[PDB]
Amino acid sequence: STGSATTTPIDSLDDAYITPVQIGTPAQTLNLDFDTGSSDLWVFSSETTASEVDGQTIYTPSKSTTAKLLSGATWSISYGDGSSSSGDVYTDTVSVGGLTVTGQAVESAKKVSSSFTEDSTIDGLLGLAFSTLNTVSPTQQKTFFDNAKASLDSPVFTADLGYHAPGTYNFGFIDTTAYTGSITYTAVSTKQGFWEWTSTGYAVGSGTFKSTSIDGIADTGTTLLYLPATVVSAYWAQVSGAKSSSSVGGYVFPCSATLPSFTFGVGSARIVIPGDYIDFGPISTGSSSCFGGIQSSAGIGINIFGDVALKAAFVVFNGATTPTLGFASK
């Protein structure tokens, strides 16, 4: 089997991407944030504290003839950005782009943090990291991909995120029309539960390539590109007036600037992030200070190849017995 679904930016900055997901019988369609940096499929629901729901579409398990309470199971997750959610668990039928999993754990939120409430466009998350990170207790549950894997034509999914435009998540096949040149594959460590890999270096604009190993995670659920402070300083030093602002929480730059591109290495291959992908716009409405899309990972504890990086590539998440990651230009 295969599946193919369009993923759409939630706003004009590509702050996140939502993908429609069918849950239950009859289908209830929720728009979920596909997150290769976590492993829980959780939704706003009829159980979510009413004051914490503000415009989201909810899953109502009592209206699904295939929903079953997973008795005694609870979940609770905290994300790198400080947001969180928790609740109980149902199993139900879940379909993405025509690919159906029966008995998928659907984690129903009883509580969500303010950041989730305040984002009316995201109805929940669909985790695509390794199932070892799933938070369900006392019986850990599998991700949608893990459940689908054996049935797929090939044990892969691909992320093709758009810049200020829709893109595609495919399951079970590689669309050879969706990228240019060849796909370069690189090793993955699953030791921390992430799609963790090592970039071979970077360049700023038309500058020379610096060969250096940068361990990090391919994370569709993180907006920005978080890299070591040395790398980030080298980038922003090429933008007149750019500075790290403790009050704003990262590098800012004059909105009048033209940003240089940023290149990262995948083996001997190179992915180029155009400068415009690194512009996250005014820090507040009407400001002439703009927020940068490349930020320091110092104090996160891990480098994160978030959407800024991934949207410059066609990305293969290869879930074969030994997982790997593939990157192509597009």
Swiss-Prot record:
The keyword Hydrolase applies. The keyword Cell division does not apply. Residues 17-328 form the Peptidase A1 domain. Belongs to the peptidase A1 family. One of its GO terms (molecular function) is aspartic-type endopeptidase activity. Its EC number is 3.4.23.22. The chain holds residues 90 to 419 of 419 of the full protein. GO terms for biological process: proteolysis. This is Endothiapepsin. The active site is at D35, S199. Disulfide bonds join C255-C290. It catalyses: Hydrolysis of proteins with specificity similar to that of pepsin A, prefers hydrophobic residues at P1 and P1', but does not cleave 14-Ala-|-Leu-15 in the B chain of insulin or Z-Glu-Tyr. Clots milk. Keywords: Aspartyl protease, Disulfide bond, Hydrolase, Protease, Signal, Zymogen.
